[PDB]
């Protein structure tokens with residue numbers, strides 16, 4: 341598409357008539373374009389800009405310091421440019437991943453649950469900026485999930501019943517400038533949870549793939565059907581033009597599975613630009629222990645254990661990271 345649809349969400353979603361009309365409109369936009377925008381208010385906008393500023397300041401730190409912000413208990417922390425792999429090929433942003441920030445005193449960490457541990461924060465100002473941002477993003481994700489259930493004529497809490505203490509996380513990204521021979525930022529892929537809410541500066545680089553009539557889509561939660569790299573050099577790829585005062589929203593793997601493909605996990609990719617590009621991707625996820633189920637295929641026994649999918653995905657992102665080594669050595673998976 342050449343112009344994405346932009347919506348205003350209400351502060352509370354109760355199931356009123358306007359809620360149902362909006363929820364249906366959001367679903368139709370996903371089914372046509374693969375993505376839509378939501379307007380941010382003054383607080384959401386500010387929190388977004390504060391997160392971007394903290395990201396830029398952190399990236400100015402020496403590489404030796406950034407590399408120390410790592411954990412062997414959680415995937416939270418720093419990812420160097422070229423460390424992450426998508427379809428076996430290195431992605432080139434530097435990243436700070438924020439997963440659920442759990443103390444070593446948390447019962448799940450004491451029990452050795454995979455991926456559970458405290459964030460290796462660079463400092464407390466950075467910590468406050470990202471946690472405040474993710475609180476705001478979580479409120480938007482809960483609204484979007486209630487509206488999605490209403491748009492499908494499902495009980496309003498269908499999806500939010502799966503996101504109590506949800507495994508929400510965020511990737512804080514800086515993409516370096518391109519060269520004459522290299523412009524790959526992140527390869528084509530689909531994300532893993534229910535929703536992706538994303539924000540970006542004014543530089544530009546994100547492309548998404550809308551649903552395509554007659555195009556079968558891999559089911560990225562299954563062994564031999566990874567979505568990484570698929571369609572990477574074939575049209576259509578919609579450029580997500582930087583637009584002031586909005587976040588973008590598209591579905592992840594769990595929504596595709598639960599809706600039987602009536603929604604599709606939106607494939608997307610990032611190209612390096614002539615300038616460095618800052619972006620934040622937020623993932624509104626089920627509880628780590630939640631089992632997603634088919635909504636429209638009754639008598640279906642299939643399930644996705646979300647925590648298993650997250651753990652499998654991040655191990656494939658970072659096969660050599662100390663986090664992955666400890667999972668392997670201690671057979672946490």
Ligand SMILES: NC(=[NH2+])NCCC[C@H](N)C(=O)O
Pocket residue numbers: 424425426427526529530531532568653654656657
């Ligand atoms: N942790 C992520 N969400 N990474 C997004 C990029 C795709 C990821 N490297 C993959 O192979 O699936």
Ligand SMILES: O=C(O)CCC(=O)C(=O)O
Pocket residue numbers: 511513526531538539540546608609610619620621
């Ligand atoms: O750079 C972006 O806008 C999104 C990056 C992304 O897809 C991701 O981190 O999952």
Ligand SMILES: [Fe+3]
Pocket residue numbers: 529530531608621
């Ligand atoms: Fe992504």
